Amino acid sequence: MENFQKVEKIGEGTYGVVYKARNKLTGEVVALKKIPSTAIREISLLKELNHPNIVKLLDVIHTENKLYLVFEFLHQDLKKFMDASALTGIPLPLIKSYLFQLLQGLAFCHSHRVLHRDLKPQNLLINTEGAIKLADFGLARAFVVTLWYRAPEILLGCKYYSTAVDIWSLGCIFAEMVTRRALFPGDSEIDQLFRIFRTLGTPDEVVWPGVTSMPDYKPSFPKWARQDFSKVVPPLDEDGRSLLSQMLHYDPNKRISAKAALAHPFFQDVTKPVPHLRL
Template identity: 30%
Template sequence: DIKCSNILLHSPPGSGIVYVKISDFGLAKKEEEDGKTQFVGTLPHMAPELFLEPAKSSQAVDIYALGITFYRLVTHKYPVHEKKFKDQRQKITHMTSIDRPEDIKDDVLWDLLTQMLNFDPGKRITAELALKHEFFTGHKANDDISPQQRQLAEKATQLEINGDRSINEYDKEPTFIVEELVIKKFLLRDIKHRQQPLQIDEKEEEKEEEEFQTEK
């Protein structure tokens, strides 16, 4: 399932680029011997429809989980985080949406998150449309593009022209390029300023993030 601890950063030597990879793929649902279908996920990241009876799973649950991941990257917390499945289900089933936290000031970011965290899976934004959202393609995103990002995009374009078939559309789009230098600066700053409460929170997450199953 998609969560912070399953997102890896990889930078090929000499590339100057950091690629984001998702690890620990698990089955969204699996069949048991008795014929029952069970859904598996990490509790705070589970979409509302997985708490229903019968539970329903689709690709939309991954969009919700990714939305929760974005939410936590910005706020350093979960919108709903109960320790037990029944308590999480009780809270989620009595909600109609995720409230906007004070930590999220950017209206464009919040618009994207509300669409990713829509409680109706049929109305939840798709991955394709999310990548076309203003947060990634608007003027603010374009203004934030660094000269290095543009250079890396131009380099990828030239490599494709020269026959490199590994180049994809995102390698040529500066807004989707993460510079290695930026990540290094962030990691060094994070290591230097890491606080004890955050360390405790991470340990609790490792302890609590077990796989919960709901029967269909």
């Protein structure tokens, strides 16, 4: 860490704290995260996971039984941009571009069976070029935090969940980009699940085989009718509703995979517009 001058505290987490920082040697501006043993082999292997849509891990520094991950630095995150554009809302060609690239990113990690596990708008970093990247990828396998984006399999006690959880999270963020409100803003675990249920219907065994046998499934969960996406994300168009729908599927094995969403007719006219930032 002695090769770094900390320019500014740019955030906070549960793993540790993040600082903008200038490399005494290279001059590079980087983001420094200040955070045992198989954490190192798991972190060092993500260093080999490079993609235009993943915030690049530049270096991992092990000293004093403290760990530091120097990442490439992007100036803004999605949550900040979203609060910034609350009165007009992100234009749809820009939402669609953001979504396309994010799914490209996830298409890549998911190939390697790496998953993010904790996507939320504060982990998605954007630049004035109109690019958007995933930050904190793979940090979870190693090693108030919101549940807003948590897939219901995780909420219901699945130990061994899959890449589909990232597709669930992405769907929630996509709904939020379009509507300008979080889709399922739970304040605790059961309110989170019960919010999911109120919109998309309590899952049963017809929509989700095996739902009733999961650890934290109770037969006594209330039973809500499903609602129409025409009421959930107006005025997103039918391609968008169709896509969103497939990304919020209860059955993790029926949920659309990133690779497959990429071929959806929603992205048929996808472009690459540049944001109006002020970062």
